[PDB]
Design a protein around this ligand. Structure first.
Ligand SMILES: CC1=NN(c2ccccc2)C(=O)C1
Ligand SMILES: [Cl-]
Ligand SMILES: [Cl-]
Length: 163
């Protein structure tokens, strides 16, 4: 574990992370996809060998020795708010089991089911709170990646408000 496990947020491409593993915002089919998934595909394409996995699950594939945890959040265009909420919580719980299993001291993570899978709604608080519920029991350093200046500020405020 990390000596003093922490949460941090950075506004930059998760493909440039400084952590021991990365969480992909994957599609269920293991396709290159869009947004974070496409950035992950360019940096670690070898990790998309047999990465297909159902909604609400995570599947780790090694790129060399670097673990890529493919986490499948729901696309809120297809799910009810209720069922989508359940699957989004579940995907983060599966990320926490994989981070623990791998024995990493740090993990790079995006906010699942924001952007293209958001169903046109602001889900920063919903996705971040499910991330916290899953990762709070882990002792890895968690570095949350985002691309929007206002989301960076709101994620930073949410981390500090619990400290
Ligand atoms: C920046 C981001 N804005 N959003 C977003 C999406 C729909 C409505 C409002 C906000 C994201 O998912 C990431
Ligand atoms: Cl960047
Ligand atoms: Cl963002």
């Amino acid at each position: 574990g990390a000596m003093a496990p922490s949460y941090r947020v950075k506004r930059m491409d998760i493909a440039k992370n400084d952590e021991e593993c990365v969480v992909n915002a994957a599609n269920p089919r293991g396709l290159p996809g869009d947004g974070v998934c496409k950035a992950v595909y360019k940096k670690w394409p070898e990790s998309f060998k047999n990465s297909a996995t159902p909604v609400g699950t995570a599947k780790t594939v090694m790129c060399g020795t670097y673990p890529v945890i493919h986490a499948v959040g729901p696309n809120f265009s297809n799910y009810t708010e209720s069922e989508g909420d359940r699957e989004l919580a579940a995907a983060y719980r599966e990320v926490a089991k994989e981070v623990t299993r791998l024995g990493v001291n740090s993990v790079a993570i995006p906010l699942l089911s924001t952007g293209v899978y958001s169903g046109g709604k602001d889900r920063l608080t919903q996705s971040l709170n499910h991330l916290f519920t899953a990762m709070d029991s882990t002792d890895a350093d968690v570095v949350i990646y985002c691309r929007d200046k206002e989301w960076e500020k709101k994620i930073s405020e949410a981390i500090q408000m619990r400290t």
